[PDB]
DNA sequence: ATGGTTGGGTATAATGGGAGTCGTCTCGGATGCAGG
DNA sequence: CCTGCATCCGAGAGCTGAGGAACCCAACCAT
């Protein structure tokens, strides 16, 4: 469940960066960022009740 | 409550504008502009004080220099024989252009601020912002080049929110320049730890900002960069437990001390 | 122009010391949060 | 896997997405070198 | 006299949001609506 | 006109101990 929070807010994050950026020169590196679900696990794995 | 479609009904009760409006408007206020400035040569007082007064006479009795001294400049004004209340004329028509145009435009303010949320300042601290913004586009705004008003506006806005986020986002204030500095490295950190498969550490980082970049300054740069917790802040399950009730003082001498 | 800020044993306490570990800036696999040069720890039986 | 609507261009990239916290064989996690449990949650079921 | 910090400007066109919360039990008053 | 009766809102719900996301250029005061 957290993880899938995590992938929503990564996937909002790549679809501003689509709309954003230019479609001539795109690919997934620079679209992707990862610290929305890192930041949804370690907020689990950490304080968590 | 909700103030957010509160502001969003008071902004879609305005219609928007076409392109005959926008530009007439835009004209009227470059020639109220210009008619500002003759009308400040020929009586010899100063341009931003006579379009104060205008713009008080204008926005009326509902907003509220003194009454006194805006009455006795207006019928200075007055007191001009032609071809020159003609240019009083042209400077409140002018005037009025101005806030049309600024009403009008105030929905590209919240379409673009609706980007810069969750990085510190509410939504419609955001708005607001981009609204001064807007304003500032209005007056800077040059409708002989045939360019749509939005073109020229939405890098006002941008400039308005981003200077706000900078300047308010922080409980501690950061100037402008080193905010960028911290923003440059962290862009640049997550992009080397997605090549790395890892974190970098600090002299990666170093190496990748470039020249007069090290290890201790990116340690400093980034010890800079914390900011506060609360006082308040619950420890345990139950809320019976803060933070400050761990902290002890240090600066009242103790009775041993005192003794 | 330096003063003690040492590490004590706290009333009540005490035992055998039967280990330590220091981890240091730089060491492999060490993240210590900015501003921290040097942790030292020790373990009492 | 990146691909154009109209052109139909195909750039694919294995991207690192982070890291995942491992159960050790007893079944605990390490976070932060400390040693945790998660403890599970019992709920009203979905349905009608 | 040097960095540190602050202010102004960038011109194709762009013009109404988003996370959420549904497993408390009572009581006393303030209040609007039903009746006569 | 009066009255009572659903309806809604807000303030309560034991003590102690432990717990932790643009960039550039140009000028201006501080020291």
Do not use: C
Not at chain 1, 29 to 48: D, H, W, Y
Not at chain 2, 98 to 124: C, D, M, P, W
Request: net charge neutral; glycine share 6%.
């Amino acid at each position: 469940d957290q993880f899938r929070v995590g992938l929503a807010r990564l996937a909002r994050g790549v679809r501003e960066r689509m709309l954003m950026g230019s479609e001539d020169s795109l690919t997934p590196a620079k679209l992707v960022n990862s610290r929305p679900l890192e930041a949804a696990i370690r907020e689990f794995f950490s304080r968590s009740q | 409550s909700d103030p957010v479609r509160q502001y969003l009904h008071e902004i879609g009760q305005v219609p928007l504008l076409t392109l005959e409006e926008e530009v007439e408007l835009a004209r009227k206020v470059e020639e109220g502009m210009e008619a500002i400035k003759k009308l400040s040569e020929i009586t010899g007082l100063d341009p931003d004080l006579i379009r104060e007064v205008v713009r008080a006479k204008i926005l009326g009795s509902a907003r509220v220099l003194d009454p006194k001294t805006v009455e006795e400049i207006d019928q200075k004004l007055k007191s001009l024989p032609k071809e020159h209340k003609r240019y009083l004329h042209i400077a409140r028509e002018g005037e009025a252009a101005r806030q049309h145009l600024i009403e009008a435009n105030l929905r590209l303010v919240v379409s673009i601020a609706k980007k810069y949320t969750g990085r510190g300042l509410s939504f419609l601290d955001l708005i607001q912002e981009g609204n001064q913004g807007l304003i500032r586009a209005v007056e800077k705004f040059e409708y002989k080049r045939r360019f749509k008003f939005s073109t020229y506006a939405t890098w006002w806005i941008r400039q308005a929110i981003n200077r706000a986020i900078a300047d308010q986002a922080r409980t501690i204030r950061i100037p402008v320049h080193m905010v960028e500095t911290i923003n440059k490295l962290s862009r640049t950190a997550r992009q080397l730890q997605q090549e790395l498969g890892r974190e970098p550490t600090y002299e990666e980082i170093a190496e990748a900002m470039g020249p007069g970049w090290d290890a201790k300054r990116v340690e400093e740069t980034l010890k800079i960069a914390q900011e506060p917790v609360s006082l308040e802040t619950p420890i345990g399950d139950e809320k019976d437990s803060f933070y400050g009730d761990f902290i002890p003082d240090e600066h009242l001498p103790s009775p041993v001390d005192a003794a | 122009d330096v003063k003690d800020t040492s590490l004590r044993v706290p009333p009540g306490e005490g035992g055998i010391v039967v280990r330590t570990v220091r981890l240091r800036r730089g060491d492999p696999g060490v993240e210590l949060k900015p501003g921290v040069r040097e942790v030292v720890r020790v373990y009492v039986a | 896997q990146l691909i154009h609507k109209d052109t139909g261009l195909i750039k694919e990239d294995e991207v690192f997405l982070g890291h995942i916290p491992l159960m050790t064989e007893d079944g605990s996690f390490i976070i932060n070198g400390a040693d945790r449990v998660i403890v599970s949650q019992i709920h009203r079921s979905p349905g009608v």
